[PDB]
Design a protein around this nucleic acid. Structure first.
Ligand SMILES: [Zn+2]
Length: 347
DNA sequence: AAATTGCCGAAGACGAA
DNA sequence: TTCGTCTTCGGCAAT
């Protein structure tokens, strides 16, 4: 359904005036919070790392959701893995961060307490209001003029080599270059405070994800000229639209609550590994390329396996995170959608 | 000492052709 | 389509 998908992608185009209005409203709130945190001893070198779909140029229909990471430069860090989770770690030191130590580990909850307290106090004096202190890692979520959501995620920045659990991840050697993978792994990795049970930190590579999407092609000139337009980003947009429309259509149910845009985003990266060549993502074959993303995502649902693109042994669809009935329900609707030329693209 | 700020240009929306 | 013009974003050199 290439003709319908292009129509869907056209209605999904963000308004140029809306992003200008949205970004300015986010900028005023974000610059205010950053300026305040830089005045505290604990968050001396806090910096802005814009992540998420908007800054990956894959935002879906309106610039109403902004993912923002307040990164913190951390030196001499010792990682101890929590059980065999491969993605959750205890943070030790090999400084203003000693106030957040519980013995030898870096207490997350102590750092979120001060991070949230400073942010909640600042915006109490502001049309923005706090919320979403559940889920651990996105420390806080803001709502600007009850219109735009801003997920603020506290993060540590470690410039050391990536943890051993990422050794066989980021399999981009045949898609991007092996030099690119070497260069990307020289960039820092990020630690965000996530519950697993307490005082743990999860690995975060949203900066690598953002850099890959803005440099998606195997060819360097991909999506720079009319002869090399690909549909990678458009397939991710449609994949995000399928999940969002289904989550909205079944909002009254609880089955689709666990599935996030990161799952679709992660599954998209694996399809790019399976289809490394740009000729496998031509504009004319938008239906085939989107069906590839739909088919692979279904295999992840049916096999209960969606590897983290950077941590292979971290199953995003394991039974501990999502029950089989929720994955079976989403599998049902995706095939019904595909069998009927995706009715949710109209409602 | 270390954080700040401006500069430059690609990405992609928009209108026209 | 294709184009130009437009605005936003991100890196770092300037201190
Ligand atoms: Zn491309």
């Amino acid at each position: 359904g290439a003709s319908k998908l292009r129509a869907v992608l056209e209605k999904l185009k963000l308004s140029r005036d809306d992003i200008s209005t949205a970004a300015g409203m986010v900028k005023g709130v974000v610059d205010h919070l950053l300026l305040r945190l830089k005045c505290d001893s604990a968050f001396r070198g806090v910096g802005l790392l814009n992540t998420g779909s908007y800054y990956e140029h894959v935002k879906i229909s309106a610039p109403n959701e902004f993912d923002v990471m307040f990164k913190l430069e951390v030196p001499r860090i010792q990682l101890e893995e929590y059980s065999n989770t491969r993605a959750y770690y205890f943070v030790k030191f090999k400084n203003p961060l000693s106030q957040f130590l519980e013995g030898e580990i870096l207490s997350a909850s102590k750092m979120l307490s001060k991070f949230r307290k400073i942010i909640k106090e600042e915006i109490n004096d502001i049309d923005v209001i706090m919320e979403a202190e559940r889920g651990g890692s996105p420390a806080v979520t803001l709502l600007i003029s009850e219109k735009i959501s801003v997920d603020i995620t506290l993060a540590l920045e470690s410039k050391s080599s990536w943890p051993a659990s990422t050794q066989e991840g980021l399999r981009i050697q045949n898609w991007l270059s092996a030099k690119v993978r070497k260069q990307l792994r020289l960039k820092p990795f990020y630690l965000v405070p996530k519950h697993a049970q307490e005082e743990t930190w999860r690995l975060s590579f949203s900066h690598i994800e953002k850099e890959i999407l803005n440099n998606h092609g195997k060819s360097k000139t991909c999506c720079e000229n009319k002869e090399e337009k690909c549909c990678r980003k458009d397939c991710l947009k449609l994949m995000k639209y399928l999940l969002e429309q289904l989550k909205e259509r079944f909002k009254d149910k609880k089955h689709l609550d666990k599935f996030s845009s990161y799952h679709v985003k992660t599954a998209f990266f694996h399809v790019c590994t399976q289809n490394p060549q740009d000729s496998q993502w031509d504009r004319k074959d938008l239906g085939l390329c989107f069906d590839n993303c739909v088919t692979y995502f279904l295999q992840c649902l049916r096999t209960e396996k969606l590897e983290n693109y950077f941590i292979p042994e971290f199953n995003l669809f394991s039974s501990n995170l999502i029950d089989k009935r929720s994955k079976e329900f989403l599998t049902k609707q995706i095939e019904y959608e595909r069998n009927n030329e995706f009715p949710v693209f109209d409602e």
